[PDB]
Design a protein around this nucleic acid. Structure first.
Length: 149
DNA sequence: GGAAGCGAAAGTGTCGCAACCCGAGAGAGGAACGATCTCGGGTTGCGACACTTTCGCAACCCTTAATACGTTC
């Protein structure tokens, strides 16, 4: 079903979407961006074909997001985030470690299962395709390690 | 995640020294052997240190990226 939806949006055949997705987790270009002090960050960008599929997926399936989440939200940004705290005198900042690379298919599916608000329902057959759409395989030899980039 | 080279940490084995034991031997005391002391060789316990083994830092960025200027993750 996910495949049919994507094929319709991208005006492609079910077969060509399915074929592309077989090795989608490996279709990432890896490069370095300089840090502002010394050193580099390593970035993995999906190939163009995969980016299109990923955008289509996000368009087709609305996942719930809390109002406290300020990043990547339409009409919100760093100004809104800062303004939320401007009237208070005491401040605490905390950070999550390796945030994106900590999110695995296992976490994703657990969150789907646990979620209070109306999550899209996926057929078991679609779960494998979704994993291939959303998660990157950093290590060629280790097919079992999929993470968000 | 983890190349290649490197060294920290930690466990094990080696080996040389000191202390001890043993029998051999020249020959004090005084006039018959053999007292006392030292040579030379062997054993055993000890502990400092050499040797061995494992771990972990982080090169590379995989065929697969985009290019109007800034900010944030």
């Amino acid at each position: 079903s996910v495949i049919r939806g994507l094929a319709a949006v991208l005006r492609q055949s079910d077969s060509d979407i399915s074929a592309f997705l077989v090795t989608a987790p490996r279709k990432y270009k890896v490069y370095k961006i300089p840090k502002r002090t010394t050193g580099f960050r390593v970035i993995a960008q999906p190939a163009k074909g995969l980016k299109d599929i990923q955008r289509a997926f996000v368009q087709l399936y609305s996942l719930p997001v809390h109002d406290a989440s300020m990043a990547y939200m339409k009409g919100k940004g760093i100004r809104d985030n800062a303004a939320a705290h401007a009237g208070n005198q005491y401040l605490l900042k905390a950070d999550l470690e390796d945030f994106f690379n900590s999110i695995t298919p296992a976490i994703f599916w657990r969150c789907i299962e646990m979620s209070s608000a109306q999550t899209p329902q996926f057929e078991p057959q679609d779960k494998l395709f979704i994993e291939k759409i959303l998660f990157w395989q950093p290590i060629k030899r280790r097919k079992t390690k999929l993470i968000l980039s």
